[PDB]
RNA sequence: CGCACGGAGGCGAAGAACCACAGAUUUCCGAAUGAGAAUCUCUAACAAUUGCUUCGCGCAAUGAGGAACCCCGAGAACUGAAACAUCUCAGUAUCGGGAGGAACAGAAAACGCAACGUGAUGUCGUUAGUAACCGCGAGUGAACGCGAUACAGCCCAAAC
RNA sequence: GAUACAGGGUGACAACCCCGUACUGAAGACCAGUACGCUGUGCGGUAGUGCCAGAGUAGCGGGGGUUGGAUAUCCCUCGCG
RNA sequence: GCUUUACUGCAGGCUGUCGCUGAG
């Protein structure tokens, strides 16, 4: 079986969904954690300094 | 337009609560004629009915019911 | 798939957003729905 | 605060229920229960409600199919409003 | 004449001698079976507590904190590091055990502010420090001409910003002259070379 | 009678529109705090951690956000050295915690143009690429003083 | 015309067509709950008195980090004091 | 990337010593 086109057919699982906190389609319904804002993981909002260039 | 601010303040707390239910029924019956797609409408009155209900509710808060 | 009440409200909204820009807006602005989403071609959230 | 009855649902299927089954259809608030829809209809129209059937429409609203008693006539109630 | 306080002070000069030696051997057995942060009604060292700012008043709290002995509890590099940065065993932290104690205490009490702390001994594996904490919201303090300074908005979370005496001493701020070129006004202002 | 020049209709001399200040309203999720949940639901709620305490959540505090700035911790490598290990990049990037409208510092167990002198602290100019460091290689690098800015000095512990 | 010839608009190059612009005046915010003023308290000096004046500290040693800090930086850690 | 009696180091194991640590 090829890792390409024939392995794409099995992809019917729902993981990333609309988040209650930030509104982005990043709430992993199996992990109960948001990959965008960190909802489910932290009380604080997920922000990182590398999301922008060092001197910006 | 037909209902002014001074006229609502001249009213007693029980007259406002009575006028509120009167306007809510005129609003529901305007929305009903709009639901049927009727022609003998008045687009400017359905707009005023909402503003008037707001005015009575604002006066109810101001006077302490 | 089984939808929840909130999921239904969102899908309901997305369907309404899919209607055309009314005939009168064209006359008022004196002359495009950029959020045109198709069930097959495009993809919604969740 | 929110009102229970928003406006009456008047379509072809709504009229069939009114003419033949004595049922009045309403677009109600999505937080309202079957019992709360029953009470509000008995108060705003002065009728006796027997059964309420609710459906959450693909419009974001809640549609309620309200059946009246034999004493009341749905065709007569919908004509005055 | 000598104060009664001066006797508690003179006893703590040598905590391994006299009556205090027996008192510590006994008290530590109970302390080892207590928590990480334990609120206590009265300070073990009254002289030191009063000297540091403690008053037997409302809103003045004291708590004993036990922190582990030794160097850094550090993980080895999981990526490429030059010989210099390949250390695990001999690395020590830049904050002293007293400061780790003050911080653990202030977190257990999110409304209170750290006034000061002092050492109350150690065994072979842990160190104990008692921390004097103050309630900035209690009127018993908001009216105290000696402690009301701690009620100011800018004194909020003061321990975490190193504004404690143990903080300022660890930041190399003791000396006013030679040796404090890279420490004053702050370590961060001097590019972290202190 | 928004963007927005339509149609129908409406509002305004009972002074509307519009602007300023103040107030009313202000759904659900959200630190999110009764419990659970992809913004909904289930049966009275300061959840959790604390201080005070009538020891009752009765009175209070914390939580999270903010462009960067600020303070306290953790802390690379590419690179430079024409290789490379100390060194360098650099206490930089990045990470953890935290405050403010600015932070931090601060009234000498100072300085040490050694004096019959200076007199809290930041910062700016200079001192100076000087002293000092360094496979004494490449490189690294202050301070006192001076001229300015602005100035402001106080409270405990103990003795009785 | 001009204490106004800054700028813009207006069917083409506008001081004088329109908004503005100089002049004069008003308000809010910041400075600042600061300065000044006031109330209260009470500054200071002589002689006598070994009454008081902050400890794991000052300091020493083992191991590290950091710094220009070199024997002579600052800090952490273990032991001693 | 990988190897080793390549260079230099870092974990880890073994071992002495100091602290915890006391009476005869
Ligand atoms: Cl604190
Ligand atoms: Cl001088
Ligand atoms: K390197
Ligand atoms: Mg459709
Ligand atoms: Mg159903
Ligand atoms: Mg390299
Ligand atoms: Mg600064
Ligand atoms: Mg909840
Ligand atoms: Mg190279
Ligand atoms: Mg060379
Ligand atoms: Mg350097
Ligand atoms: Mg000097
Ligand atoms: Mg170095
Ligand atoms: Na699709
Ligand atoms: Na509707
Ligand atoms: Na705290
Ligand atoms: Na609002
Ligand atoms: Na609260
Ligand atoms: Na309580
Ligand atoms: Na090279
Ligand atoms: Na190479
Ligand atoms: Na070197
Ligand atoms: Na040492
Ligand atoms: Na240093
Ligand atoms: Na390879
Ligand atoms: Sr599968
Ligand atoms: Sr988690
Ligand atoms: Sr962040
Ligand atoms: Sr497709
Ligand atoms: Sr529809
Ligand atoms: Sr806080
Ligand atoms: Sr001065
Ligand atoms: Sr002294």
mmCIF file of N, CA, C and O (backbone and C1' of nucleotides) in Angstrom, chain F residues 125-159:
data_model
loop_
_atom_site.group_PDB
_atom_site.id
_atom_site.type_symbol
_atom_site.label_atom_id
_atom_site.label_comp_id
_atom_site.label_asym_id
_atom_site.label_seq_id
_atom_site.Cartn_x
_atom_site.Cartn_y
_atom_site.Cartn_z
ATOM 1 P P G F 125 25.751 59.296 26.013
ATOM 2 O "O5'" G F 125 26.814 60.481 26.100
ATOM 3 C "C5'" G F 125 26.650 61.684 25.319
ATOM 4 C "C4'" G F 125 27.644 62.738 25.753
ATOM 5 C "C3'" G F 125 29.095 62.296 25.859
ATOM 6 O "O3'" G F 125 29.786 62.233 24.630
ATOM 7 C "C1'" G F 125 28.546 63.553 27.757
ATOM 8 P P U F 126 30.824 61.039 24.385
ATOM 9 O "O5'" U F 126 32.001 61.261 25.443
ATOM 10 C "C5'" U F 126 32.918 62.347 25.296
ATOM 11 C "C4'" U F 126 33.726 62.557 26.559
ATOM 12 C "C3'" U F 126 34.757 61.512 26.963
ATOM 13 O "O3'" U F 126 35.975 61.670 26.229
ATOM 14 C "C1'" U F 126 33.577 62.274 28.871
ATOM 15 P P U F 127 37.036 60.456 26.139
ATOM 16 O "O5'" U F 127 37.501 60.207 27.645
ATOM 17 C "C5'" U F 127 38.312 61.163 28.351
ATOM 18 C "C4'" U F 127 38.513 60.723 29.784
ATOM 19 C "C3'" U F 127 39.060 59.315 29.957
ATOM 20 O "O3'" U F 127 40.478 59.338 29.919
ATOM 21 C "C1'" U F 127 37.164 59.599 31.339
ATOM 22 P P A F 128 41.298 58.004 29.578
ATOM 23 O "O5'" A F 128 40.795 57.641 28.112
ATOM 24 C "C5'" A F 128 41.562 56.789 27.251
ATOM 25 C "C4'" A F 128 40.638 55.937 26.425
ATOM 26 C "C3'" A F 128 39.560 56.680 25.640
ATOM 27 O "O3'" A F 128 39.236 55.895 24.506
ATOM 28 C "C1'" A F 128 38.540 55.202 27.142
ATOM 29 P P G F 129 39.577 56.417 23.033
ATOM 30 O "O5'" G F 129 39.150 55.181 22.122
ATOM 31 C "C5'" G F 129 40.037 54.064 21.939
ATOM 32 C "C4'" G F 129 40.140 53.258 23.210
ATOM 33 C "C3'" G F 129 41.180 52.149 23.165
ATOM 34 O "O3'" G F 129 41.670 51.973 24.481
ATOM 35 C "C1'" G F 129 39.112 51.196 23.629
ATOM 36 P P U F 130 42.926 51.012 24.748
ATOM 37 O "O5'" U F 130 43.537 51.581 26.107
ATOM 38 C "C5'" U F 130 44.199 52.866 26.156
ATOM 39 C "C4'" U F 130 44.085 53.454 27.541
ATOM 40 C "C3'" U F 130 44.244 52.445 28.666
ATOM 41 O "O3'" U F 130 45.597 52.230 28.988
ATOM 42 C "C1'" U F 130 42.324 53.748 29.054
ATOM 43 P P A F 131 46.130 50.736 29.157
ATOM 44 O "O5'" A F 131 45.561 50.288 30.573
ATOM 45 C "C5'" A F 131 46.060 50.890 31.775
ATOM 46 C "C4'" A F 131 45.277 50.418 32.969
ATOM 47 C "C3'" A F 131 45.158 48.915 33.138
ATOM 48 O "O3'" A F 131 46.309 48.336 33.737
ATOM 49 C "C1'" A F 131 43.048 49.916 33.496
ATOM 50 P P A F 132 46.766 46.863 33.301
ATOM 51 O "O5'" A F 132 45.459 45.993 33.533
ATOM 52 C "C5'" A F 132 45.031 45.644 34.855
ATOM 53 C "C4'" A F 132 43.799 44.787 34.778
ATOM 54 C "C3'" A F 132 43.913 43.613 33.825
ATOM 55 O "O3'" A F 132 44.581 42.496 34.382
ATOM 56 C "C1'" A F 132 41.920 44.759 33.369
ATOM 57 P P C F 133 45.276 41.427 33.402
ATOM 58 O "O5'" C F 133 44.040 40.620 32.815
ATOM 59 C "C5'" C F 133 43.069 40.021 33.686
ATOM 60 C "C4'" C F 133 41.984 39.386 32.866
ATOM 61 C "C3'" C F 133 42.489 38.337 31.890
ATOM 62 O "O3'" C F 133 42.568 37.073 32.531
ATOM 63 C "C1'" C F 133 41.079 39.858 30.756
ATOM 64 P P C F 134 43.683 36.022 32.078
ATOM 65 O "O5'" C F 134 43.404 35.846 30.523
ATOM 66 C "C5'" C F 134 42.299 35.069 30.056
ATOM 67 C "C4'" C F 134 42.336 34.996 28.557
ATOM 68 C "C3'" C F 134 43.662 34.541 27.981
ATOM 69 O "O3'" C F 134 43.702 33.127 27.948
ATOM 70 C "C1'" C F 134 42.915 36.465 26.837
ATOM 71 P P G F 135 45.109 32.366 27.852
ATOM 72 O "O5'" G F 135 45.462 32.382 26.299
ATOM 73 C "C5'" G F 135 44.634 31.705 25.331
ATOM 74 C "C4'" G F 135 45.282 30.404 24.909
ATOM 75 C "C3'" G F 135 46.646 30.523 24.250
ATOM 76 O "O3'" G F 135 47.691 30.586 25.213
ATOM 77 C "C1'" G F 135 45.286 29.052 22.997
ATOM 78 P P C F 136 49.134 31.137 24.780
ATOM 79 O "O5'" C F 136 48.849 32.644 24.376
ATOM 80 C "C5'" C F 136 48.261 33.540 25.312
ATOM 81 C "C4'" C F 136 48.337 34.945 24.789
ATOM 82 C "C3'" C F 136 49.746 35.505 24.626
ATOM 83 O "O3'" C F 136 49.723 36.487 23.588
ATOM 84 C "C1'" C F 136 48.585 36.782 26.209
ATOM 85 P P G F 137 50.559 36.256 22.229
ATOM 86 O "O5'" G F 137 49.482 35.699 21.195
ATOM 87 C "C5'" G F 137 48.377 36.515 20.772
ATOM 88 C "C4'" G F 137 47.568 35.796 19.724
ATOM 89 C "C3'" G F 137 46.318 36.516 19.250
ATOM 90 O "O3'" G F 137 46.614 37.455 18.235
ATOM 91 C "C1'" G F 137 45.793 34.270 19.717
ATOM 92 P P A F 138 45.770 38.813 18.142
ATOM 93 O "O5'" A F 138 44.343 38.354 17.617
ATOM 94 C "C5'" A F 138 44.153 37.859 16.281
ATOM 95 C "C4'" A F 138 42.766 37.284 16.156
ATOM 96 C "C3'" A F 138 41.665 38.219 16.623
ATOM 97 O "O3'" A F 138 41.298 39.112 15.588
ATOM 98 C "C1'" A F 138 41.374 36.124 17.645
ATOM 99 P P G F 139 40.613 40.510 15.955
ATOM 100 O "O5'" G F 139 39.161 40.088 16.459
ATOM 101 C "C5'" G F 139 38.483 40.823 17.489
ATOM 102 C "C4'" G F 139 38.054 39.896 18.604
ATOM 103 C "C3'" G F 139 37.486 40.596 19.824
ATOM 104 O "O3'" G F 139 36.116 40.916 19.655
ATOM 105 C "C1'" G F 139 39.082 39.014 20.524
ATOM 106 P P U F 140 35.528 42.269 20.285
ATOM 107 O "O5'" U F 140 35.550 42.003 21.855
ATOM 108 C "C5'" U F 140 34.762 40.958 22.437
ATOM 109 C "C4'" U F 140 35.087 40.820 23.903
ATOM 110 C "C3'" U F 140 34.863 42.049 24.767
ATOM 111 O "O3'" U F 140 33.500 42.166 25.144
ATOM 112 C "C1'" U F 140 36.957 41.093 25.290
ATOM 113 P P G F 141 32.807 43.614 25.220
ATOM 114 O "O5'" G F 141 33.588 44.355 26.383
ATOM 115 C "C5'" G F 141 33.477 43.910 27.736
ATOM 116 C "C4'" G F 141 34.392 44.718 28.614
ATOM 117 C "C3'" G F 141 34.273 46.221 28.440
ATOM 118 O "O3'" G F 141 33.199 46.770 29.183
ATOM 119 C "C1'" G F 141 36.541 45.613 28.349
ATOM 120 P P A F 142 32.652 48.236 28.816
ATOM 121 O "O5'" A F 142 33.739 49.198 29.477
ATOM 122 C "C5'" A F 142 33.393 50.099 30.545
ATOM 123 C "C4'" A F 142 33.384 49.364 31.862
ATOM 124 C "C3'" A F 142 33.344 50.241 33.098
ATOM 125 O "O3'" A F 142 32.024 50.593 33.442
ATOM 126 C "C1'" A F 142 35.110 48.719 33.310
ATOM 127 P P A F 143 31.674 52.120 33.755
ATOM 128 O "O5'" A F 143 32.426 52.384 35.131
ATOM 129 C "C5'" A F 143 32.233 51.513 36.245
ATOM 130 C "C4'" A F 143 33.294 51.754 37.291
ATOM 131 C "C3'" A F 143 33.460 53.187 37.766
ATOM 132 O "O3'" A F 143 32.513 53.515 38.779
ATOM 133 C "C1'" A F 143 35.575 52.291 37.238
ATOM 134 P P C F 144 32.039 55.037 38.967
ATOM 135 O "O5'" C F 144 33.268 55.729 39.709
ATOM 136 C "C5'" C F 144 33.642 55.337 41.046
ATOM 137 C "C4'" C F 144 34.905 56.051 41.479
ATOM 138 C "C3'" C F 144 34.905 57.563 41.318
ATOM 139 O "O3'" C F 144 34.239 58.226 42.379
ATOM 140 C "C1'" C F 144 36.924 56.695 40.468
ATOM 141 P P G F 145 33.389 59.551 42.072
ATOM 142 O "O5'" G F 145 34.410 60.514 41.324
ATOM 143 C "C5'" G F 145 35.600 60.996 41.976
ATOM 144 C "C4'" G F 145 36.418 61.823 41.013
ATOM 145 C "C3'" G F 145 35.649 62.926 40.309
ATOM 146 O "O3'" G F 145 35.521 64.097 41.098
ATOM 147 C "C1'" G F 145 36.865 61.710 38.708
ATOM 148 P P C F 146 34.217 65.018 40.939
ATOM 149 O "O5'" C F 146 34.381 65.677 39.499
ATOM 150 C "C5'" C F 146 35.607 66.329 39.111
ATOM 151 C "C4'" C F 146 35.593 66.616 37.629
ATOM 152 C "C3'" C F 146 34.318 67.266 37.119
ATOM 153 O "O3'" C F 146 34.331 68.663 37.335
ATOM 154 C "C1'" C F 146 34.914 65.488 35.685
ATOM 155 P P G F 147 32.968 69.428 37.700
ATOM 156 O "O5'" G F 147 32.192 69.530 36.317
ATOM 157 C "C5'" G F 147 32.736 70.297 35.245
ATOM 158 C "C4'" G F 147 31.932 70.086 33.997
ATOM 159 C "C3'" G F 147 30.447 70.307 34.155
ATOM 160 O "O3'" G F 147 30.142 71.683 34.099
ATOM 161 C "C1'" G F 147 30.815 68.329 32.940
ATOM 162 P P A F 148 28.794 72.207 34.771
ATOM 163 O "O5'" A F 148 27.684 71.625 33.799
ATOM 164 C "C5'" A F 148 26.446 71.124 34.302
ATOM 165 C "C4'" A F 148 25.775 70.289 33.247
ATOM 166 C "C3'" A F 148 24.359 69.886 33.585
ATOM 167 O "O3'" A F 148 23.461 70.946 33.282
ATOM 168 C "C1'" A F 148 25.546 67.985 32.862
ATOM 169 P P U F 149 22.307 71.324 34.337
ATOM 170 O "O5'" U F 149 21.281 70.119 34.194
ATOM 171 C "C5'" U F 149 20.649 69.843 32.930
ATOM 172 C "C4'" U F 149 19.877 68.554 33.013
ATOM 173 C "C3'" U F 149 18.906 68.460 34.170
ATOM 174 O "O3'" U F 149 17.700 69.141 33.837
ATOM 175 C "C1'" U F 149 20.141 66.456 34.006
ATOM 176 P P A F 150 17.069 70.191 34.875
ATOM 177 O "O5'" A F 150 16.601 69.273 36.090
ATOM 178 C "C5'" A F 150 15.624 68.238 35.889
ATOM 179 C "C4'" A F 150 15.656 67.264 37.032
ATOM 180 C "C3'" A F 150 15.526 67.878 38.409
ATOM 181 O "O3'" A F 150 14.172 68.183 38.709
ATOM 182 C "C1'" A F 150 17.284 66.315 38.424
ATOM 183 P P C F 151 13.812 68.933 40.083
ATOM 184 O "O5'" C F 151 14.313 67.892 41.179
ATOM 185 C "C5'" C F 151 14.643 68.310 42.497
ATOM 186 C "C4'" C F 151 15.378 67.211 43.206
ATOM 187 C "C3'" C F 151 15.875 67.608 44.577
ATOM 188 O "O3'" C F 151 14.848 67.452 45.543
ATOM 189 C "C1'" C F 151 17.661 66.684 43.365
ATOM 190 P P A F 152 14.825 68.408 46.823
ATOM 191 O "O5'" A F 152 16.184 68.032 47.560
ATOM 192 C "C5'" A F 152 16.335 68.179 48.979
ATOM 193 C "C4'" A F 152 16.505 66.828 49.626
ATOM 194 C "C3'" A F 152 17.433 65.855 48.901
ATOM 195 O "O3'" A F 152 18.074 65.013 49.850
ATOM 196 C "C1'" A F 152 15.316 64.882 49.150
ATOM 197 P P G F 153 19.299 65.568 50.729
ATOM 198 O "O5'" G F 153 18.893 65.099 52.196
ATOM 199 C "C5'" G F 153 17.862 65.796 52.907
ATOM 200 C "C4'" G F 153 16.644 64.920 53.125
ATOM 201 C "C3'" G F 153 16.566 64.124 54.410
ATOM 202 O "O3'" G F 153 16.334 64.894 55.575
ATOM 203 C "C1'" G F 153 15.679 62.824 52.671
ATOM 204 P P C F 154 16.428 64.177 57.010
ATOM 205 O "O5'" C F 154 15.060 63.378 57.102
ATOM 206 C "C5'" C F 154 14.911 62.268 57.985
ATOM 207 C "C4'" C F 154 13.859 61.339 57.446
ATOM 208 C "C3'" C F 154 13.547 60.136 58.311
ATOM 209 O "O3'" C F 154 12.663 60.490 59.360
ATOM 210 C "C1'" C F 154 13.863 59.416 56.098
ATOM 211 P P C F 155 12.743 59.714 60.764
ATOM 212 O "O5'" C F 155 12.159 58.273 60.435
ATOM 213 C "C5'" C F 155 10.796 58.127 60.011
ATOM 214 C "C4'" C F 155 10.436 56.674 59.908
ATOM 215 C "C3'" C F 155 10.781 55.831 61.122
ATOM 216 O "O3'" C F 155 9.800 55.977 62.147
ATOM 217 C "C1'" C F 155 11.492 54.720 59.167
ATOM 218 P P C F 156 10.007 55.246 63.565
ATOM 219 O "O5'" C F 156 9.957 53.697 63.204
ATOM 220 C "C5'" C F 156 10.466 52.720 64.113
ATOM 221 C "C4'" C F 156 10.721 51.423 63.394
ATOM 222 C "C3'" C F 156 11.237 50.313 64.290
ATOM 223 O "O3'" C F 156 10.145 49.676 64.944
ATOM 224 C "C1'" C F 156 12.521 50.393 62.296
ATOM 225 P P A F 157 10.271 49.243 66.488
ATOM 226 O "O5'" A F 157 11.497 48.232 66.497
ATOM 227 C "C5'" A F 157 11.370 46.929 65.920
ATOM 228 C "C4'" A F 157 12.667 46.175 66.045
ATOM 229 C "C3'" A F 157 13.290 46.176 67.423
ATOM 230 O "O3'" A F 157 12.636 45.267 68.288
ATOM 231 C "C1'" A F 157 14.962 46.514 65.796
ATOM 232 P P A F 158 12.180 45.759 69.746
ATOM 233 O "O5'" A F 158 13.560 46.023 70.496
ATOM 234 C "C5'" A F 158 14.476 44.947 70.743
ATOM 235 C "C4'" A F 158 15.796 45.485 71.240
ATOM 236 C "C3'" A F 158 15.737 46.411 72.442
ATOM 237 O "O3'" A F 158 15.574 45.706 73.665
ATOM 238 C "C1'" A F 158 17.180 47.336 70.837
ATOM 239 P P A F 159 14.734 46.379 74.859
ATOM 240 O "O5'" A F 159 15.769 47.407 75.505
ATOM 241 C "C5'" A F 159 17.093 46.982 75.893
ATOM 242 C "C4'" A F 159 17.988 48.183 76.143
ATOM 243 C "C3'" A F 159 17.477 49.222 77.131
ATOM 244 O "O3'" A F 159 17.753 48.816 78.473
ATOM 245 C "C1'" A F 159 18.364 50.302 75.216
#
